[PDB]
């Protein structure tokens, strides 16, 4: 546990370091500057927005994991809600952007009308309202704990059949889902890309919908590539609790371990917008 | 880039045959529309498809073939007049990546004289 106790508060100090001034450079530029704020940078002031609601509460991570939780009930059930928040809206916002993409490359002429709605009001209803809907299992379930000899912020549900379904909800509506959304959306483009000499009509206009489409793309591979060693770890948990698995609790606890450092190092999907920016921004 | 070599010329006589051939070599990653120009008047344009569209005073006497598989075009010269002695150039539209842009080439240049 020492290791683990010496591991983990250093990679939350480097994200939330890291985070913070990616996502308030990111927020300062586009917003207060009035600067590039096209359809995907629209999409990707909304994505920076929700990262750094998430990252201004790492020191309570942090602080939980070194030591213990003297905050309260009404913080930890605000840290979980926002953790929610933040983990729902980034993948929605990836597969509004591949969504995007689709209809911008696809339907290249017809496309303004239900490209200016869809980014404009659609956007609300099909992120932030379910994102924040989805948060009531955060406002009835997370509470604090007396363990012994210290505290601890998490949600207690009444056993572990909630467990279950939880994480199956976090499966689906985090990975599945908007993934399936953005294999169909990517594999039709990539179709199109390779086939169609031209697109639209122009040079100009083919050239400009590759390069907007590219980080795109590299966005999405990093976000998965960060997230899929935690739902790997988190589905053999899954089926650890389905009783499918039997093995020694050595098994177990090497679980446990695996999925707290991988959920720890997944958090660095928060400095994806800010890299991605620097890298091509050149 | 992309380098494209040109081959078919040399001393030829009138109403005879011939055949040029122009390949694509370099850093491909697809070919779209390749022909055969004279400003540069197109002769003979066959695109990936096949869609052969020949020029005015092409018509009954040249044909053009490609083979997408060797990256080459090859045109098939009957029934020279002498207005058709002149250079050819072989034009290749291509592109080296998903994410670039179209670019456009040109090859070096073709010398056809009908004897007569
Ligand atoms: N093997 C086997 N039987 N599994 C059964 C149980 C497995 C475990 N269930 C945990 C559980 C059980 C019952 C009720 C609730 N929770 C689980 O789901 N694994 C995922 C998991 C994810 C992350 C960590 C470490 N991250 C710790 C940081 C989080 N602390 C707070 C974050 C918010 C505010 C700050 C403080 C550890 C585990
Ligand atoms: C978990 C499931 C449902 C989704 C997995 C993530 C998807 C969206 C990611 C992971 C692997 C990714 C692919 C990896 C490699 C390539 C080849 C190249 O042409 C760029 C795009 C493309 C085709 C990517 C498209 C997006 C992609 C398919
Ligand atoms: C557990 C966590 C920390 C793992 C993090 C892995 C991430 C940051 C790494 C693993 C593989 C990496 C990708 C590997 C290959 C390419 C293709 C290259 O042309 C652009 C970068 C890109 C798209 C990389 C982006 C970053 C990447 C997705």
């Given at each position: 546990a020492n290791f683990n106790k010496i591991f983990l508060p250093t990679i939350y100090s480097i994200i939330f370091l890291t985070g913070i001034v990616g996502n308030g450079l990111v927020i300062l530029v586009m917003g207060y500057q009035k600067k590039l704020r096209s359809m995907t940078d629209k999409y990707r002031l909304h994505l920076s927005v929700a990262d750094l609601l998430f990252v201004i509460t790492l020191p309570f991570?942090?602080?939980?994991?070194?030591?213990?939780?003297?905050?309260?009930?009404?913080?930890?059930?605000?840290?979980?809600?926002?953790?929610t928040v933040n983990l729902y809206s980034s993948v929605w916002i990836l597969a509004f952007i591949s969504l995007d993409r689709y209809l911008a490359i696809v339907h290249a002429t017809n496309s303004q009308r239900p490209r200016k709605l869809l980014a404009e009001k659609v956007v609300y209803v099909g992120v932030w309202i379910p994102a924040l809907?989805?948060?009531?299992?955060?406002?009835?379930?997370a509470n604090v704990s007396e363990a012994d000899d210290r505290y601890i912020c998490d949600r207690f549900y009444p056993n572990d059949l909630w467990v279950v379904?939880?994480?199956?909800?976090?499966?689906?509506?985090?990975?599945?889902?908007?993934?399936?959304?953005?294999?169909?959306?990517?594999?039709?483009?990539?179709?199109?890309?390779?086939?169609?000499?031209?697109?639209?009509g122009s040079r100009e206009k083919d050239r400009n919908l590759r390069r907007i489409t590219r980080p795109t793309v590299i966005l999405i591979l990093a976000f998965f590539a960060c997230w899929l060693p935690y739902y790997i770890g988190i589905s053999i948990?899954?089926?650890?609790?389905?009783?499918?698995?039997?093995?020694?609790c050595e098994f177990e606890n090497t679980v446990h371990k695996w999925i707290s450092?991988?959920?720890?190092?997944?958090?660095?999907?928060?400095?994806?917008?800010?890299?991605?920016?620097?890298?091509?921004?050149? | 880039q992309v380098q494209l070599q040109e081959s078919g010329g040399g001393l030829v006589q009138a109403g005879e045959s011939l055949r040029l051939?122009?390949?694509?070599s370099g850093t491909?990653?697809?070919?779209?529309?390749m022909g055969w120009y004279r400003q540069r008047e197109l002769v003979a344009s066959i695109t990936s498809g096949g869609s052969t569209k020949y020029g005015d005073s092409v018509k009954g006497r040249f044909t053009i073939s490609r083979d997408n598989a060797k990256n080459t075009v090859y045109l098939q010269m009957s029934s020279l007049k002498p207005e058709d002695t002149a250079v050819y150039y072989c034009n290749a539209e291509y592109r080296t990546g998903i994410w670039e842009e179209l670019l456009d080439g040109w090859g070096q240049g073709t010398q056809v004289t009908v004897s007569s």
């Open positions: 991570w942090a602080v939980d994991a070194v030591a213990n939780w003297y905050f309260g009930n009404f913080l930890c059930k605000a840290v979980h809600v926002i953790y809907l989805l948060t009531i299992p955060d406002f009835i379930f379904v939880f994480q199956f909800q976090h499966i689906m509506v985090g990975l599945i889902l908007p993934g399936i959304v953005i294999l169909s959306c990517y594999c039709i483009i990539i179709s199109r890309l390779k086939s169609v000499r031209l697109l639209s948990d899954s089926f650890i609790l389905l009783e499918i698995i039997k093995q020694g450092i991988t959920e720890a190092l997944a958090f660095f999907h928060c400095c994806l917008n800010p890299i991605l920016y620097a890298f091509l921004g050149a | 051939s122009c390949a694509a491909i990653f697809r070919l779209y529309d």
